[PDB]
Amino acid sequence: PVAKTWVCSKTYVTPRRPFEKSRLDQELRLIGEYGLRNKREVWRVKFTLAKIRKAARELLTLDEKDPKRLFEGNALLRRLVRIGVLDEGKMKLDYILGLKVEDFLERRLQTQVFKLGLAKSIHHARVLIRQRHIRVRKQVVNIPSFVVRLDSQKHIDFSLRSPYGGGRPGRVKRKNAKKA
Amino acid sequence: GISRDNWHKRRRTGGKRKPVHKKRKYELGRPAANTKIGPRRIHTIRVRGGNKKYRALRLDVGNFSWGSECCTRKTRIIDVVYNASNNELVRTKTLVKNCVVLVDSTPYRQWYESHYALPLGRKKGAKLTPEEEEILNKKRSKKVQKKFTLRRKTAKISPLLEEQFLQGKLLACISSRPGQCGRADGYVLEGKELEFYLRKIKAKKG
Amino acid sequence: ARGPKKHLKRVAAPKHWMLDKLTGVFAPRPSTGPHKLRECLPLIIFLRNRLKYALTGDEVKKICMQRFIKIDGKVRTDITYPTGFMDVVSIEKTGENFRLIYDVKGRFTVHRITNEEAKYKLCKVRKILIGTKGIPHLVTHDARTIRYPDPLIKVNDTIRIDLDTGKITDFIKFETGNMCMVTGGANLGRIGVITNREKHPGSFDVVHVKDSIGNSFATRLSNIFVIGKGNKPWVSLPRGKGVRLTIAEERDKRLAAKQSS
RNA sequence: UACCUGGUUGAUCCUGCCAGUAAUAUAUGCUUGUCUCAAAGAUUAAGCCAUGCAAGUCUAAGUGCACACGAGUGAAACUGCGAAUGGCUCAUUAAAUCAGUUAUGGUUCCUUUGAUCACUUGGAUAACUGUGGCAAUUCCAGAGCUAAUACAUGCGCCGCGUGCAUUUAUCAGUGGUGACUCUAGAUAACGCCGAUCGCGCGCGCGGCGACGGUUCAUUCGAAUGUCUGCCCUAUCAACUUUCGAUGGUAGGUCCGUCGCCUACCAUGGUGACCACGGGUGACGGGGAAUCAGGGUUCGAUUCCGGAGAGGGAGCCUGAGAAACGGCUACCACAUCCAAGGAAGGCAGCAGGCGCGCAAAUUACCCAUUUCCGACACGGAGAGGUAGUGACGAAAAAUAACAAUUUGGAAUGAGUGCAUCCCAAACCCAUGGGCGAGGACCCAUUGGAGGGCAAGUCUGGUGCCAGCAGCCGCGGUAAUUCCAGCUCCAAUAGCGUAUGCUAACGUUGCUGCAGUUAAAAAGCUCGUAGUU
RNA sequence: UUUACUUUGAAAAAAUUAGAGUGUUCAAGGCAGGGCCCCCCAUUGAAUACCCCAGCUAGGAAUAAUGGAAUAGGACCCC
RNA sequence: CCGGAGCGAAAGCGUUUGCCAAGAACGUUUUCAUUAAUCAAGAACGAAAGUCGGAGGUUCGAAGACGAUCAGAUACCGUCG
RNA sequence: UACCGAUUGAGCGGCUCAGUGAGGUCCUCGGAUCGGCGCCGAGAAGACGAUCGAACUCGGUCGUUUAGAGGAAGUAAAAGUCGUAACAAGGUUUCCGUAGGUGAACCUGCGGAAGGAUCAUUA
RNA sequence: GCAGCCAGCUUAGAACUGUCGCGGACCAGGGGAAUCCGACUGUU
RNA sequence: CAGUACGAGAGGAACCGCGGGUUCAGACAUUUGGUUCGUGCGCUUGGCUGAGGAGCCACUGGCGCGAAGCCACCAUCUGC
Ligand SMILES: [Mg+2]
Ligand SMILES: [Mg+2]
Ligand SMILES: [Mg+2]
Ligand SMILES: [Mg+2]
Ligand SMILES: [Mg+2]
Ligand SMILES: [Mg+2]
Ligand SMILES: [Mg+2]
Ligand SMILES: [Mg+2]
Ligand SMILES: [Mg+2]
Ligand SMILES: [Mg+2]
């Protein structure tokens, strides 16, 4: 009898074929295109998409006049259009099945800061967040795997304490200054 | 100790069942009554819930009632004559429920003469010698003699019942549970129930 | 299994308390009292979680040890009092008069001052037991014993009794058309009007309750808690009597109000 | 993602299994810089245990002359209550536990809530003072005082009355029930009615509380039954009773029903729709893993219920225990003796031995969570926290921006102070400060013939040593082995062993097969079953 | 004549799972919080589904059984 | 004659005549009126060899003897049984 | 690697027949004793009987685990000896059932089967 | 449909009872596991 | 004696003294045990005297206990 949780779920799924020549390049292409650490992150976003596809799939099997499909279906749609992976015009569960892995990779924080020009390259965009620079509505984020929403997309900027923003410089800037 | 549980018996199919747990206290049992005939020996038993239970080991008096009439007088239990369960409850003189006994008839006649004013258990030929019995055959007031007339018209008891009044031993039956209640209450046989046990006593004593 | 149990795990507690699973292992086991353990709310929760006036379990003790709370006007000291249904919790030190009443769902709400109504309550009679020499008895809701009942009251009606004298003032007969607040799960807090009563010899009887917007359903006879004669209640109701806004309807109100604030 | 690939042959199409593949969970191998969570002596041994702890408890309110401190908190002490919960483990248990269902009209209760309900007489006694026994224990003995909330004390019948609890018998019909032999009424009869306490006024009084009893309540709950549902086994087919097996009568017994038991009678009850018997690496369930669907497997394991405390058995006390952190024996085991005796149960929390492939600290504290008692105060190894921890899970370094190698620029990990945090400490997290260019502050683990992504590379080892899950590689130019470089799914994880799931339509209900690849009884009759 | 079958509701522990709601910096999770100097998710939450089988509750009468009259102790009304 | 013809549940069944009681198919405006199909448990039958008890033992012929062949035949071949 | 195996097996373990039976409860009694004060009261040790029943000494039965001289197989090795049984007409067509016999595969009889080397052989 | 009468001798069950003793004398198989030989009964 | 002499150790004596025992010898019956036809007492089977009572019979009816005697390293005493 301990006051704990013991509730934890996995975020990735290892593929069936370990050395599928066609699959190895399709995941490696997503590595450099979005600047990912290893294949685990590819399988992670692939697993989140697989859950959303299966969640939308079981709803499409029910009748349209079912209140469970109407409520649970709209709630899934509102969350997809909230984060920006799906557009408000294509707000239907049929468009969920057409979502690809790159649709959720674009909503990644390290990619949004690259589309906004705050970073030089996609790999530097990871280090830009890894060094505690990017903030979202005065809330600084350190991990690059953050997902922004549409009501928070136009608030991605530098922190009030980062050298790239407005504040004190880094420790290397102050080190070379005192020695010169 | 003694237990009345069911997990020690065989199933309805005949297969032996293994005990799920050891003997529990809430299913305990205690020895049988075996209430003999003796003066005022009763033990108290603490039971489930802190209550009290009265264990009657030997009792000599019994609060029996009369069936035909409305009379409940405590009388001295003499002996047991027959028991439908087994003849062992009468060879050992054990007072239990639904056993026919031969109880005294002095309290029954004492109230019958004071209410009906009619000799019933008197010997055929002998008269009332003591003066206390002549007061039941005197002349009373107008408001007192009028009520005894309407009571004398309905007094012809069955001939099979008036015979026991001659010997002073009425065939009664313990209608209570002595070991549990602590009191050997009951009633007196009459009608068809009196003829049934008399036939069993006649066969057993024949 | 050797006798009575004196502990209550937090995950084993009734869901109507909404306790934090990451703070402790045990739930506040409500002290023995007038109400069932499954249909009550420990006095600590109502003072620490609902009202938030207590921060820990020792500070709520200081509430009862200073004689400020008083259920039905009688100051209690057990921080785990049942405080079941219709139990008026008046606070004369703070002027607040709470009644633990259910919401559209099954939960204990913070229903505030009802001074002119809090002086009494409603009680569901259970049985009509005959005492000595022909004196009937009535067992009320919160274990309050009332004697000398009217010969017209049955085992299903409701009565109102003042907190001081504890005498039956008025009663509401049970028939098709009386306002009711269904209790017993999946309808706890749904306020409606009784419409039908099915009879089952040897088992439970079925009754049908129709809410304000026509949300008619069915339930057992032992689930009726009459609260008003006809369609008018006696005591103040919380925000939403028995409307029971659906998941889609509750969704509409939350988005339309947050955008304005 | 509703997936397959190698291997029988000179070659081919098949049957078919082996092997390959991916999760899962135990162990183990090598490796391991950060953070947040988190399993953790279940598996073989419910084997055995050194030491310590885990239930005691005092308010203004049952009893208050330790002068230790000075009326009053007082330590001891007697009375009341708890210790029957929690925790631990899964040995036992196969209609049993358990789950749904529900019956008690077939049953009782501590605490709580609400009811209701003979001017205080009696004598000891503890602590203590004092005298002692035994080697020794939570051993006690003798005497002398001193307390109880311990213990004891408006009618029937016929002159003239007036509370009851229970047990039988009889009569009549207030509130009920689907249905009372119900609750009520009446007749004849047969241990409950307060000898108690606190902070506190007026002038024979009242208004505020506690404790406690009596039958009815309520509630926390227990206990016993109805209906339905358990894996494997027919090399278990009949089974149950000269000691109840099935039913009948009466009684005993228990809170109560009952073959629960006794006695008289009947020859019954169950069974191929699988009883009975046996096995289980069987506690049941909620659930877990894997799954297109259908399923397969797992559930000792924090919740619920049950079971047990070395094996049994039998009890005390209490409302509730057949209690073992309570007793009485026997059995097994074992400790101190002065050898007369005495005292033992860690499948409680740490720890030790043993067992093993297999599993942490004799750590800190009642603050949270709550629970127990005389209770705001006191107690809790229940619990909380920390250490150990690559069970497992979520985040996430080993560069980046530049140059054609050098410039700064950005940041912790680490390393040192405050604050926050915490019951205190601790991991963080934060504020500045101290902090990387072979940014040496450096990543390994299986591999590189095919299956199956990656070298006829380099050298020697020459059917030897070895490699290889399978097919297969070595008999002096080995793409396999013995090494480098390089390369590859990788990745702070990665191999290995075993269980199990998918693969497997190779258990086929969905959904397989039986002419020749494993296979329709030689043939027909025939009940149950199935249709 | 009554069953099997389908649909509805209460019941069919919590946790877990599915799953609405909430930017624990994200996530695993948790059941808790963005903003205006004592109001403001209209006295800030808040839901639901599933819970097989059996029993229970309210319809339908297809399928498959069963069954009411043949020595008519036949169904109805009489009288 | 005797056949890729019949019959029987199969194993199996062919000289004449006689006896005995069955059977499919067909015929039918007969009759009975769902009395069915398949079938764990159970049973009839079941070539041949073999086994026990009698008769008869022609031929064949396990075994066995012997004759031939072969490096060797404990066999095929031959006589006999 | 299992099986058979005298041993009149056996370390090993469960329900039970019949004995014996601690301990407790209960009952029938007993009356050491101290409170009255020479009778009513309380009352321990202890005992008869009943009942529950651990455990022990012998047996029956079931489950389960193991020793065994010796005997007889299977499989994996090297395929060493012998012969050629089978695969082409395998040189006697193969094979089934059954029986007997034989160093060995095998031979033979009887009845089969084609999985035969014949789907066929003439009025 | 039985009432009356007559007639024995066994069997079962129960209480009580004595020193747990009772087929009280008498009468009246020790048993089990194996080997050898002869089958057995019979005969010498 | 003595853990001593002796021995590097490991080991390890002897005389006097004390207390017992083996075998044997000679006794003996207080005790324990055996025997009992003192046929002593009790009980008891079958039978017999009509029964009770009291007895007898069954080559000592049987059983329990058993005196006196005799007797046992199976009890005890003594042995220079
Ligand atoms: Mg021999
Ligand atoms: Mg002979
Ligand atoms: Mg012979
Ligand atoms: Mg002979
Ligand atoms: Mg002698
Ligand atoms: Mg005689
Ligand atoms: Mg005589
Ligand atoms: Mg003679
Ligand atoms: Mg003789
Ligand atoms: Mg003798």
Curated annotation (Swiss-Prot), chain B:
Residues 1-26 are annotated as: Disordered. One of its GO terms (cellular component) is small-subunit processome. InterPro entries: Ribosomal_eS8, Ribosomal_eS8_CS, Ribosomal_Se8/biogenesis_NSA2. Pfam families: Ribosomal_S8e. CDD domains: Ribosomal_S8e_like. GO terms for biological process: chordate embryonic development; maturation of SSU-rRNA from tricistronic rRNA transcript (SSU-rRNA, 5.8S rRNA, LSU-rRNA); regulation of cell cycle; ribosomal small subunit biogenesis; translation. Disulfide bonds: none annotated. Residues 7-25 have a biased composition (Basic residues). It is found in: Cytoplasm; Membrane; Nucleus, Nucleolus. Keywords: Cytoplasm, Lipoprotein, Membrane, Nucleus, Ribonucleoprotein, Ribosomal protein. It is a lipid-anchor. PROSITE patterns: RIBOSOMAL_S8E. GO terms for molecular function: structural constituent of ribosome. The keyword Amino-acid biosynthesis does not apply. Component of the small ribosomal subunit. The ribosome is a large ribonucleoprotein complex responsible for the synthesis of proteins in the cell. Part of the small subunit (SSU) processome, first precursor of the small eukaryotic ribosomal subunit. During the assembly of the SSU processome in the nucleolus, many ribosome biogenesis factors, an RNA chaperone and ribosomal proteins associate with the nascent pre-rRNA and work in concert to generate RNA folding, modifications, rearrangements and cleavage as well as targeted degradation of pre-ribosomal RNA by the RNA exosome. Belongs to the eukaryotic ribosomal protein eS8 family. Component of the small ribosomal subunit. Identified in a IGF2BP1-dependent mRNP granule complex containing untranslated mRNAs. Part of the small subunit (SSU) processome, composed of more than 70 proteins and the RNA chaperone small nucleolar RNA (snoRNA) U3. This is Small ribosomal subunit protein eS8. The gene is rps8.
UniProtKB/Swiss-Prot annotation, chain C:
Keywords: Cytoplasm, Nucleus, Ribonucleoprotein, Ribosomal protein, RNA-binding, rRNA-binding. Coiled coil: none annotated. It is found in: Cytoplasm; Nucleus, Nucleolus. Component of the small ribosomal subunit. The ribosome is a large ribonucleoprotein complex responsible for the synthesis of proteins in the cell. Part of the small subunit (SSU) processome, first precursor of the small eukaryotic ribosomal subunit. During the assembly of the SSU processome in the nucleolus, many ribosome biogenesis factors, an RNA chaperone and ribosomal proteins associate with the nascent pre-rRNA and work in concert to generate RNA folding, modifications, rearrangements and cleavage as well as targeted degradation of pre-ribosomal RNA by the RNA exosome. This is Small ribosomal subunit protein eS4. Component of the small ribosomal subunit. Part of the small subunit (SSU) processome, composed of more than 70 proteins and the RNA chaperone small nucleolar RNA (snoRNA) U3. Residues 41-104 form the S4 RNA-binding domain. The keyword RNA-binding applies. Gene3D superfamilies: 2.30.30.30, 2.40.50.740, RNA-binding S4 domain (3.10.290.10). One of its GO terms (molecular function) is rRNA binding. It comes from the Eukaryota. One of its GO terms (cellular component) is small-subunit processome.
